Amino acid sequence: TVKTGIAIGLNKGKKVTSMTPAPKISYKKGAASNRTKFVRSLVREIAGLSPYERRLIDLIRNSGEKRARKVAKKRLGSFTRAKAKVEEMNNIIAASRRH
């Protein structure tokens, strides 16, 4: 925000006139490109599914997304990674059955 010029409290700190630095493209390090998406989709079509992904699909069908996410967290080590994998498999299910 705007520093309040005093040494304590909310937004504490000295007040100097602000400048906005140019956004460095290294901060755009994880972004996806159209060709990158194309390659990943083609490679997915060619290679298919890993066995743990297959049983994640089965769990999503039968035992629930909560249990699928828990099994994915067991096999990945990270809750955010389990969320990402389960959402990816959900998109795959929707595209492979409905559309």
Partner: protein
Amino acid sequence: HFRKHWQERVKVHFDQAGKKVSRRNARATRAAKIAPRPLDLLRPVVRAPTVKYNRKVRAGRGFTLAEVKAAGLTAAYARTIGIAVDHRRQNRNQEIFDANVQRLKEYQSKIIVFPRNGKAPEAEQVLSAAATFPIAQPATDVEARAVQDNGESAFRTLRLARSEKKFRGIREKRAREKAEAE
């Protein structure tokens, strides 16, 4: 609880004077090797970090790309002309930006670049760009002013700032409660 029962190592600096002589000889040798250029590059002015030291400025590593562009030159040319450039420093303080731009303008006006093919005019060697362009602590306030007291009690101001920071979360929960109460 437990003592140091073993034997230490000893480093003795008998070579202190010899190494001073050697550093002086090396500086003279480098001056002769790069004459008539200075021994040091131009460095920018920079605020020290942390709240203990942020009250003063010191020399930094190199001028920002934005500052070099504002001074009217490119990073490659500035590096060849004797200016330190640091690509990883960013500008968010217009005071520091303006000081560094003025620093670069003065350096450009004070140096003479010789043509890369033409005959060299005589020019003595100045060893310290740092001495010729010293870092100066920015002037904060004038020495004497008039008194302006509106009875706000700076101590009360500090106490209230602490109180607001301390009870911000509870008042935010109560604001969300006021949002969720119909």
